[PDB]
User: Which sequence fits this backbone?
Protein backbone atom coordinates (compact mmCIF):
# COMPACT_ATOMS: atom_id res chain seq x y z
CA UNK A 1 0.00 0.00 0.00
CA UNK A 2 1.05 3.61 -0.58
CA UNK A 3 1.01 4.23 3.20
CA UNK A 4 -0.14 7.82 2.66
CA UNK A 5 -3.62 6.44 1.93
CA UNK A 6 -3.80 5.19 5.53
CA UNK A 7 -2.78 8.55 7.02
CA UNK A 8 -5.90 10.18 5.56
CA UNK A 9 -8.20 7.68 7.29
CA UNK A 10 -6.56 8.40 10.66
CA UNK A 11 -7.70 12.03 10.45
CA UNK A 12 -11.31 11.40 9.46
CA UNK A 13 -11.98 9.18 12.49
CA UNK A 14 -10.96 12.06 14.76
CA UNK A 15 -13.38 14.45 13.04
CA UNK A 16 -16.36 12.10 13.36
CA UNK A 17 -15.78 11.84 17.12
CA UNK A 18 -16.53 15.56 17.60
CA UNK A 19 -18.89 16.09 14.65
CA UNK A 20 -22.32 15.61 16.27
CA UNK A 21 -21.69 18.11 19.08
CA UNK A 22 -21.83 21.55 17.40
CA UNK A 23 -24.58 24.13 17.69
CA UNK A 24 -26.84 24.89 20.65
CA UNK A 25 -28.44 21.43 20.68
CA UNK A 26 -26.42 18.24 20.47
CA UNK A 27 -25.81 15.00 22.37
CA UNK A 28 -22.65 15.23 24.47
CA UNK A 29 -20.08 12.48 24.97
CA UNK A 30 -18.86 10.78 28.15
CA UNK A 31 -15.27 10.02 29.16
CA UNK A 32 -14.07 7.07 31.23
CA UNK A 33 -10.61 6.07 32.48
CA UNK A 34 -9.12 2.99 34.10
CA UNK A 35 -9.41 4.65 37.53
CA UNK A 36 -13.18 5.13 37.55
CA UNK A 37 -13.74 8.87 37.27
CA UNK A 38 -16.44 10.04 34.86
CA UNK A 39 -17.09 13.52 33.46
CA UNK A 40 -19.36 14.87 30.73
CA UNK A 41 -19.07 18.13 28.80
CA UNK A 42 -19.73 19.68 25.40
CA UNK A 43 -16.53 21.72 24.99
CA UNK A 44 -14.27 20.81 22.08
CA UNK A 45 -10.66 20.78 23.25
CA UNK A 46 -11.79 19.42 26.63
CA UNK A 47 -12.70 16.11 24.97
CA UNK A 48 -9.84 15.74 22.47
CA UNK A 49 -7.35 16.53 25.25
CA UNK A 50 -8.36 13.32 27.06
CA UNK A 51 -8.53 10.99 24.04
CA UNK A 52 -5.65 8.50 23.87
CA UNK A 53 -3.92 8.92 20.51
CA UNK A 54 -1.97 6.11 18.83
CA UNK A 55 -0.85 7.07 15.33
CA UNK A 56 1.81 9.77 14.89
CA UNK A 57 -0.11 11.82 12.31
CA UNK A 58 -3.16 11.86 14.61
CA UNK A 59 -1.38 14.38 16.86
CA UNK A 60 -1.28 16.93 14.02
CA UNK A 61 -5.06 17.36 14.20
CA UNK A 62 -5.33 18.04 17.94
CA UNK A 63 -2.29 20.32 17.68
CA UNK A 64 -4.29 22.87 15.69
CA UNK A 65 -7.17 22.80 18.18
CA UNK A 66 -4.76 23.31 21.08
CA UNK A 67 -3.31 26.51 19.60
CA UNK A 68 -6.81 27.89 18.96
CA UNK A 69 -7.81 27.62 22.62
CA UNK A 70 -4.94 29.75 23.95
CA UNK A 71 -5.71 32.48 21.40
CA UNK A 72 -9.48 33.02 21.50
CA UNK A 73 -11.23 29.99 23.00
CA UNK A 74 -14.61 29.14 21.52
CA UNK A 75 -14.80 27.71 18.02
CA UNK A 76 -12.39 24.77 18.25
CA UNK A 77 -14.95 22.15 17.19
CA UNK A 78 -15.82 23.77 13.86
CA UNK A 79 -12.11 23.95 13.02
CA UNK A 80 -11.96 20.14 12.97
CA UNK A 81 -15.19 19.62 11.00
CA UNK A 82 -14.13 21.92 8.16
CA UNK A 83 -10.71 20.24 8.02
CA UNK A 84 -12.36 16.82 7.79
CA UNK A 85 -14.19 17.65 4.57
CA UNK A 86 -10.95 18.81 2.94
CA UNK A 87 -9.51 15.32 3.47
CA UNK A 88 -12.59 13.46 2.23
CA UNK A 89 -12.92 15.52 -0.95
CA UNK A 90 -9.18 15.19 -1.58
CA UNK A 91 -9.50 11.40 -1.45
CA UNK A 92 -11.97 11.27 -4.34
CA UNK A 93 -10.03 13.93 -6.25
CA UNK A 94 -6.67 12.24 -5.67
CA UNK A 95 -8.12 8.88 -6.76
CA UNK A 96 -8.62 10.37 -10.26
CA UNK A 97 -4.87 10.20 -11.04
CA UNK A 98 -4.42 13.67 -9.51
CA UNK A 99 -1.04 14.38 -7.95
CA UNK A 100 -1.31 15.56 -4.31
CA UNK A 101 1.01 18.51 -5.04
CA UNK A 102 -1.28 20.50 -7.35
CA UNK A 103 -4.12 19.96 -4.87
CA UNK A 104 -2.20 21.85 -2.17
CA UNK A 105 -1.89 24.88 -4.46
CA UNK A 106 -5.66 24.98 -4.91
CA UNK A 107 -6.48 25.16 -1.20
CA UNK A 108 -3.57 27.53 -0.56
CA UNK A 109 -4.61 29.94 -3.32
CA UNK A 110 -8.32 29.56 -2.53
CA UNK A 111 -7.74 30.21 1.17
CA UNK A 112 -5.93 33.47 0.42
CA UNK A 113 -8.81 34.73 -1.73
CA UNK A 114 -11.45 33.95 0.91
CA UNK A 115 -9.37 35.68 3.61
CA UNK A 116 -9.61 39.10 1.96
CA UNK A 117 -13.16 38.52 0.70
CA UNK A 118 -14.51 37.83 4.20
CA UNK A 119 -13.00 41.07 5.50
CA UNK A 120 -15.48 43.06 3.39
CA UNK A 121 -18.47 40.96 4.50
CA UNK A 122 -17.94 41.92 8.16
CA UNK A 123 -19.43 45.02 9.78
CA UNK A 124 -17.86 47.60 12.08
CA UNK A 125 -19.35 48.26 15.52
CA UNK A 126 -18.50 50.27 18.61
CA UNK A 127 -15.57 49.50 20.89
CA UNK A 128 -17.59 49.77 24.13
CA UNK A 129 -21.30 49.42 23.35
CA UNK A 130 -23.42 48.10 26.22
CA UNK A 131 -25.96 46.61 23.77
CA UNK A 132 -23.87 44.85 21.11
CA UNK A 133 -21.62 42.98 23.56
CA UNK A 134 -24.68 41.53 25.30
CA UNK A 135 -25.71 39.68 22.13
CA UNK A 136 -22.20 38.31 21.51
CA UNK A 137 -22.07 36.52 24.86
CA UNK A 138 -25.52 35.02 24.23
CA UNK A 139 -24.32 32.93 21.28
CA UNK A 140 -21.20 31.76 23.15
CA UNK A 141 -22.85 30.44 26.32
CA UNK A 142 -25.75 29.07 24.26
CA UNK A 143 -23.35 26.94 22.21
CA UNK A 144 -22.33 24.94 25.28
CA UNK A 145 -25.95 24.20 26.22
CA UNK A 146 -27.50 26.06 29.15
CA UNK A 147 -31.05 27.27 28.46
CA UNK A 148 -32.01 27.91 32.08
CA UNK A 149 -30.54 31.23 33.30
CA UNK A 150 -28.38 32.90 30.64
CA UNK A 151 -30.08 36.25 29.94
CA UNK A 152 -28.80 37.54 33.29
CA UNK A 153 -25.33 36.00 33.10
CA UNK A 154 -24.69 37.89 29.86
CA UNK A 155 -25.06 41.31 31.50
CA UNK A 156 -22.75 40.27 34.35
CA UNK A 157 -19.85 38.93 32.28
CA UNK A 158 -19.94 42.02 30.06
CA UNK A 159 -19.77 44.29 33.11
CA UNK A 160 -16.60 42.59 34.40
CA UNK A 161 -14.65 42.55 31.12
CA UNK A 162 -15.32 46.28 30.71
CA UNK A 163 -13.13 47.08 33.73
CA UNK A 164 -10.21 45.16 32.19
CA UNK A 165 -10.18 47.42 29.10
CA UNK A 166 -6.75 49.05 29.37
CA UNK A 167 -5.90 52.52 28.04
CA UNK A 168 -4.44 51.20 24.76
CA UNK A 169 -6.68 48.38 23.52
CA UNK A 170 -5.14 45.09 24.63
CA UNK A 171 -7.28 42.75 26.74
CA UNK A 172 -5.98 40.43 29.46
CA UNK A 173 -7.64 37.27 30.75
CA UNK A 174 -5.63 36.78 33.97
CA UNK A 175 -7.56 39.61 35.68
CA UNK A 176 -10.80 37.57 35.59
CA UNK A 177 -10.91 34.88 38.28
CA UNK A 178 -13.56 32.15 38.42
CA UNK A 179 -14.96 30.55 41.57
CA UNK A 180 -17.27 27.52 41.75
CA UNK A 181 -19.35 26.50 44.76
CA UNK A 182 -22.72 24.91 45.41
CA UNK A 183 -25.70 27.00 46.47
CA UNK A 184 -29.35 26.96 45.40
CA UNK A 185 -29.84 28.35 41.86
CA UNK A 186 -27.99 29.84 38.90
CA UNK A 187 -29.53 33.29 39.44
CA UNK A 188 -27.47 33.69 42.63
CA UNK A 189 -24.35 34.45 40.56
CA UNK A 190 -22.97 37.94 41.14
CA UNK A 191 -19.87 40.00 40.36
CA UNK A 192 -17.45 40.77 43.22
CA UNK A 193 -15.15 43.77 42.98
CA UNK A 194 -12.31 42.28 45.03
CA UNK A 195 -10.99 38.73 45.19
CA UNK A 196 -12.44 35.64 46.88
CA UNK A 197 -10.61 33.08 49.04
CA UNK A 198 -12.64 29.93 49.76
CA UNK A 199 -11.19 28.94 53.13
CA UNK A 200 -12.24 28.54 56.75
CA UNK A 201 -11.21 30.56 59.80
CA UNK A 202 -8.79 29.11 62.32
CA UNK A 203 -10.41 30.73 65.39
CA UNK A 204 -13.95 32.05 65.77
CA UNK A 205 -12.84 34.48 68.48
CA UNK A 206 -11.12 36.67 65.87
CA UNK A 207 -12.93 39.81 64.65
CA UNK A 208 -15.76 39.25 62.19
CA UNK A 209 -15.33 42.54 60.30
CA UNK A 210 -12.56 45.16 60.32
CA UNK A 211 -12.20 48.31 58.21
CA UNK A 212 -8.95 49.95 57.08
CA UNK A 213 -6.83 46.82 57.45
CA UNK A 214 -3.45 46.02 55.86
CA UNK A 215 -2.63 43.05 53.63
CA UNK A 216 0.39 40.93 54.56
CA UNK A 217 1.63 37.79 52.80
CA UNK A 218 3.96 35.02 53.93
CA UNK A 219 4.75 32.18 51.50
CA UNK A 220 6.75 30.23 54.08
CA UNK A 221 6.44 28.61 57.48
CA UNK A 222 5.80 30.76 60.57
CA UNK A 223 7.72 29.45 63.59
CA UNK A 224 11.24 29.38 65.02
CA UNK A 225 13.81 30.04 62.29
CA UNK A 226 17.02 28.02 62.15
CA UNK A 227 20.43 29.56 61.50
CA UNK A 228 21.26 29.78 57.80
CA UNK A 229 25.06 29.65 57.98
CA UNK A 230 26.78 26.67 59.60
CA UNK A 231 25.94 27.08 63.29
CA UNK A 232 24.16 25.36 66.18
CA UNK A 233 21.05 26.13 68.22
CA UNK A 234 21.74 28.02 71.45
CA UNK A 235 20.01 26.41 74.44
CA UNK A 236 21.37 25.11 77.76
CA UNK A 237 18.52 25.43 80.27
CA UNK A 238 17.89 22.57 82.74
CA UNK A 239 14.17 22.17 81.98
CA UNK A 240 14.52 22.08 78.20
CA UNK A 241 11.21 20.19 77.92
CA UNK A 242 9.31 23.52 78.01
CA UNK A 243 11.76 26.13 76.68
CA UNK A 244 11.28 25.15 73.03
CA UNK A 245 7.51 25.30 73.54
CA UNK A 246 7.66 28.85 74.92
CA UNK A 247 10.09 29.86 72.17
CA UNK A 248 7.48 29.07 69.51
CA UNK A 249 4.79 31.01 71.39
CA UNK A 250 7.19 33.96 71.61
CA UNK A 251 7.91 33.85 67.87
CA UNK A 252 4.17 33.94 67.14
CA UNK A 253 3.42 36.54 69.84
CA UNK A 254 6.52 38.77 69.80
CA UNK A 255 7.32 38.91 66.08
CA UNK A 256 3.72 39.92 65.34
CA UNK A 257 4.29 43.02 67.48
CA UNK A 258 6.99 44.23 65.09
CA UNK A 259 4.90 43.34 62.03
CA UNK A 260 1.96 45.50 63.14
CA UNK A 261 4.38 48.35 63.92
CA UNK A 262 4.80 48.84 60.15
CA UNK A 263 1.04 49.30 59.68
CA UNK A 264 0.19 45.62 59.27
CA UNK A 265 -2.97 44.05 60.69
CA UNK A 266 -4.13 40.78 59.13
CA UNK A 267 -1.92 37.87 58.06
CA UNK A 268 -2.01 35.10 55.45
CA UNK A 269 0.42 32.30 56.31
CA UNK A 270 1.06 29.36 54.00
CA UNK A 271 1.59 26.40 56.35
CA UNK A 272 -0.05 25.66 59.68
CA UNK A 273 0.54 27.33 63.03
CA UNK A 274 1.51 25.92 66.41
CA UNK A 275 -1.39 24.72 68.54
CA UNK A 276 -0.64 26.82 71.63
CA UNK A 277 0.19 29.81 69.41
CA UNK A 278 -3.41 30.04 68.17
CA UNK A 279 -4.58 30.72 71.73
CA UNK A 280 -2.71 34.03 72.00
CA UNK A 281 -3.53 35.04 68.42
CA UNK A 282 -7.23 34.44 69.11
CA UNK A 283 -7.38 36.94 71.98
CA UNK A 284 -5.21 39.43 70.08
CA UNK A 285 -7.51 39.27 67.05
CA UNK A 286 -5.28 38.67 64.03
CA UNK A 287 -6.91 37.16 60.94
CA UNK A 288 -4.99 34.25 59.44
CA UNK A 289 -5.43 31.25 57.16
CA UNK A 290 -3.58 27.93 57.36
CA UNK A 291 -2.80 25.69 54.38
CA UNK A 292 -3.34 27.81 51.25
CA UNK A 293 -2.51 27.03 47.63
CA UNK A 294 0.54 28.75 46.16
CA UNK A 295 -1.56 30.04 43.26
CA UNK A 296 -3.61 32.12 45.70
CA UNK A 297 -0.58 33.98 47.06
CA UNK A 298 0.33 35.01 43.49
CA UNK A 299 -2.97 36.53 42.36
CA UNK A 300 -3.22 38.70 45.49
CA UNK A 301 0.31 40.11 45.30
CA UNK A 302 -0.09 40.70 41.55
CA UNK A 303 -3.44 42.47 42.02
CA UNK A 304 -2.72 44.31 45.29
CA UNK A 305 0.94 45.07 44.58
CA UNK A 306 2.43 43.34 47.63
CA UNK A 307 5.69 41.36 47.77
CA UNK A 308 5.89 37.65 48.59
CA UNK A 309 8.30 37.45 51.54
CA UNK A 310 9.46 34.25 53.22
CA UNK A 311 11.52 35.53 56.18
CA UNK A 312 9.20 36.55 59.02
CA UNK A 313 11.98 38.69 60.52
CA UNK A 314 12.41 40.86 57.40
CA UNK A 315 8.89 42.35 57.12
CA UNK A 316 9.17 46.09 56.46
CA UNK A 317 6.32 48.44 55.57
CA UNK A 318 6.83 48.33 51.79
CA UNK A 319 6.48 44.53 51.94
CA UNK A 320 2.86 44.88 53.12
CA UNK A 321 -0.21 45.71 51.03
CA UNK A 322 -2.89 48.38 51.27
CA UNK A 323 -6.49 47.40 51.98
CA UNK A 324 -9.93 48.96 52.32
CA UNK A 325 -12.53 46.56 53.70
CA UNK A 326 -11.85 42.96 54.75
CA UNK A 327 -14.52 40.54 55.98
CA UNK A 328 -15.19 36.80 56.11
CA UNK A 329 -19.00 36.70 56.07
CA UNK A 330 -21.05 33.70 54.93
CA UNK A 331 -23.83 33.15 52.39
CA UNK A 332 -25.28 29.84 51.15
CA UNK A 333 -22.68 27.44 52.49
CA UNK A 334 -19.43 27.74 54.42
CA UNK A 335 -17.97 31.16 55.18
CA UNK A 336 -15.43 32.63 52.77
CA UNK A 337 -12.93 35.47 53.04
CA UNK A 338 -13.75 38.51 50.88
CA UNK A 339 -10.71 40.77 50.45
CA UNK A 340 -11.75 44.03 48.77
CA UNK A 341 -8.95 45.93 47.02
CA UNK A 342 -10.58 49.35 46.69
CA UNK A 343 -7.28 51.26 46.91
CA UNK A 344 -5.93 49.82 43.62
CA UNK A 345 -8.56 47.59 41.99
CA UNK A 346 -7.58 45.76 38.81
CA UNK A 347 -8.77 42.14 38.95
CA UNK A 348 -12.24 40.83 39.80
CA UNK A 349 -13.86 37.47 40.49
CA UNK A 350 -17.17 35.75 39.74
CA UNK A 351 -18.77 33.46 42.34
CA UNK A 352 -20.84 30.83 40.52
CA UNK A 353 -23.73 29.07 42.26
CA UNK A 354 -25.86 26.05 41.45
CA UNK A 355 -27.78 23.08 42.77
CA UNK A 356 -25.07 20.45 42.25
CA UNK A 357 -21.34 20.49 41.56
CA UNK A 358 -21.91 18.48 38.37
CA UNK A 359 -23.89 21.37 36.85
CA UNK A 360 -21.70 24.36 37.74
CA UNK A 361 -18.70 22.68 36.09
CA UNK A 362 -20.40 22.96 32.69
CA UNK A 363 -21.14 26.70 32.78
CA UNK A 364 -17.72 27.29 34.35
CA UNK A 365 -16.09 26.69 30.96
CA UNK A 366 -18.62 28.79 29.03
CA UNK A 367 -17.99 31.94 31.07
CA UNK A 368 -14.24 31.38 30.66
CA UNK A 369 -14.42 31.10 26.87
CA UNK A 370 -16.74 34.12 26.76
CA UNK A 371 -13.91 36.34 28.01
CA UNK A 372 -11.86 35.60 24.90
CA UNK A 373 -14.83 35.97 22.56
CA UNK A 374 -15.84 39.35 23.98
CA UNK A 375 -12.28 40.34 24.90
CA UNK A 376 -10.96 40.20 21.35
CA UNK A 377 -14.05 42.09 20.13
CA UNK A 378 -13.16 45.15 22.22
CA UNK A 379 -9.59 45.05 20.89
CA UNK A 380 -10.48 44.76 17.18
CA UNK A 381 -14.03 46.11 16.99
CA UNK A 382 -15.65 44.21 14.12
CA UNK A 383 -18.12 41.32 14.29
CA UNK A 384 -19.87 39.22 11.64
CA UNK A 385 -23.20 37.43 11.24
CA UNK A 386 -23.14 34.00 12.88
CA UNK A 387 -25.26 30.94 12.30
CA UNK A 388 -23.56 29.86 9.08
CA UNK A 389 -24.73 32.98 7.23
CA UNK A 390 -21.14 34.10 6.59
CA UNK A 391 -19.85 30.69 5.47
CA UNK A 392 -22.72 29.94 3.07
CA UNK A 393 -21.95 33.15 1.17
CA UNK A 394 -18.36 32.16 0.38
CA UNK A 395 -19.46 28.83 -1.13
CA UNK A 396 -21.42 30.78 -3.76
CA UNK A 397 -18.90 33.57 -4.43
CA UNK A 398 -15.74 31.44 -4.60
CA UNK A 399 -17.12 29.69 -7.69
CA UNK A 400 -16.84 32.96 -9.62
CA UNK A 401 -13.08 33.07 -9.01
CA UNK A 402 -12.60 29.45 -10.11
CA UNK A 403 -13.90 30.27 -13.60
CA UNK A 404 -10.91 32.54 -14.19
CA UNK A 405 -8.45 29.79 -13.27
CA UNK A 406 -7.58 27.14 -15.86
CA UNK A 407 -6.08 23.66 -15.69
CA UNK A 408 -6.54 20.77 -13.30
CA UNK A 409 -6.12 23.16 -10.35
CA UNK A 410 -9.55 24.63 -11.15
CA UNK A 411 -11.25 21.38 -10.14
CA UNK A 412 -9.58 21.58 -6.72
CA UNK A 413 -10.85 25.12 -6.11
CA UNK A 414 -14.45 24.05 -6.74
CA UNK A 415 -14.09 21.23 -4.21
CA UNK A 416 -12.96 23.69 -1.53
CA UNK A 417 -16.16 25.72 -1.94
CA UNK A 418 -18.40 22.66 -1.54
CA UNK A 419 -16.29 21.37 1.36
CA UNK A 420 -16.67 24.67 3.23
CA UNK A 421 -20.46 24.17 3.05
CA UNK A 422 -20.53 21.81 6.03
CA UNK A 423 -21.54 23.89 9.08
CA UNK A 424 -25.17 24.53 7.98
CA UNK A 425 -25.91 20.84 7.29
CA UNK A 426 -24.63 19.30 10.54
CA UNK A 427 -26.18 22.18 12.49
CA UNK A 428 -29.65 21.09 11.32
CA UNK A 429 -28.99 17.33 11.44
CA UNK A 430 -28.54 17.35 15.22
CA UNK A 431 -31.63 19.55 15.64
CA UNK A 432 -34.18 17.52 13.67
CA UNK A 433 -34.75 19.39 10.42
CA UNK A 434 -33.98 17.92 7.01
CA UNK A 435 -30.42 17.89 5.65
CA UNK A 436 -31.09 18.62 1.95
CA UNK A 437 -34.59 20.07 1.60
CA UNK A 438 -33.61 23.11 3.67
CA UNK A 439 -30.27 23.71 1.92
CA UNK A 440 -31.94 24.70 -1.35
CA UNK A 441 -34.21 27.11 0.54
CA UNK A 442 -31.33 29.09 2.05
CA UNK A 443 -29.48 29.08 -1.28
CA UNK A 444 -32.40 30.75 -3.07
CA UNK A 445 -32.97 33.28 -0.28
CA UNK A 446 -29.34 34.42 -0.52
CA UNK A 447 -28.55 34.15 -4.24
CA UNK A 448 -27.53 37.75 -5.02
CA UNK A 449 -29.88 40.55 -3.99
CA UNK A 450 -30.56 38.80 -0.68
CA UNK A 451 -29.10 40.15 2.53
CA UNK A 452 -25.67 39.01 3.75
CA UNK A 453 -26.99 37.67 7.08
CA UNK A 454 -29.49 34.92 6.17
CA UNK A 455 -28.83 31.53 7.74
CA UNK A 456 -30.86 29.02 9.74
CA UNK A 457 -32.41 28.98 13.22
CA UNK A 458 -32.69 25.64 15.01
CA UNK A 459 -35.33 27.00 17.42
CA UNK A 460 -37.99 28.17 14.97
CA UNK A 461 -36.78 25.81 12.26
CA UNK A 462 -37.20 28.05 9.21
CA UNK A 463 -35.06 30.29 7.03
CA UNK A 464 -35.07 33.93 8.13
CA UNK A 465 -32.81 36.90 8.79
CA UNK A 466 -30.38 35.75 11.49
CA UNK A 467 -29.17 39.30 12.19
CA UNK A 468 -32.53 40.24 13.69
CA UNK A 469 -32.32 37.29 16.10
CA UNK A 470 -29.11 38.71 17.57
CA UNK A 471 -26.90 35.69 16.82
CA UNK A 472 -23.48 37.23 16.07
CA UNK A 473 -19.84 36.52 16.86
CA UNK A 474 -16.44 38.14 16.24
CA UNK A 475 -14.54 37.40 13.04
CA UNK A 476 -11.46 36.38 15.05
CA UNK A 477 -12.89 32.86 15.39
CA UNK A 478 -13.42 32.36 11.64
CA UNK A 479 -10.37 34.17 10.25
CA UNK A 480 -8.09 32.00 12.40
CA UNK A 481 -9.96 28.71 11.96
CA UNK A 482 -9.96 28.85 8.15
CA UNK A 483 -6.35 30.07 8.10
CA UNK A 484 -5.17 27.14 10.23
CA UNK A 485 -7.28 24.59 8.34
CA UNK A 486 -5.74 25.46 4.97
CA UNK A 487 -2.24 25.13 6.47
CA UNK A 488 -2.79 21.98 8.55
CA UNK A 489 -3.79 19.93 5.49
CA UNK A 490 -0.46 20.84 3.87
CA UNK A 491 1.35 18.79 6.53
CA UNK A 492 -0.63 15.59 5.91
CA UNK A 493 -0.84 15.77 2.10
CA UNK A 494 2.88 16.48 1.67
CA UNK A 495 4.19 13.87 4.13
CA UNK A 496 4.39 10.34 2.74
CA UNK A 497 7.62 8.67 3.89
CA UNK A 498 7.35 6.97 7.30
CA UNK A 499 10.79 5.84 8.49
CA UNK A 500 10.99 3.94 11.79
CA UNK A 501 14.03 5.86 13.01
CA UNK A 502 14.63 5.22 16.71
CA UNK A 503 16.33 7.61 19.12
CA UNK A 504 15.34 11.10 17.96
CA UNK A 505 15.20 13.15 21.20
Assistant:
Amino acid sequence: RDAQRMNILAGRIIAETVRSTLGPKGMDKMLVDDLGDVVVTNDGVTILREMSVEHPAAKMLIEVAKTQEKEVGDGTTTAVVVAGELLRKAEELLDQNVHPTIVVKGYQAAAQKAQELLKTIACEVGAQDKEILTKIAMTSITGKGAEKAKEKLAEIIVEAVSAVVDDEGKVDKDLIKIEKKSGASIDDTELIKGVLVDKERVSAQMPKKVTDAKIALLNCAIEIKETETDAEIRITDPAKLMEFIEQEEKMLKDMVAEIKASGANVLFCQKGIDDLAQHYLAKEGIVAARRVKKSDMEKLAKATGANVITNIKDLSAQDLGDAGLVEERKISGDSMIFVEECKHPKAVTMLIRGTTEHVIEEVARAVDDAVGVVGCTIEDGRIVSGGGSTEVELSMKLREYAEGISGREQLAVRAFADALEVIPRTLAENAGLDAIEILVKVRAAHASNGNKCAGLNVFTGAVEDMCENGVVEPLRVKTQAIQSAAESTEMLLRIDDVIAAEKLR
Observations:
- The domain at 209-350 is CATH 3.50.7.10 (GroEL).
- The CA atoms of residues 57 and 169 lie 39 Å apart.
- The two ends are 29 Å apart (CA to CA).
- The first strand starts at residue 29 and ends at 32.
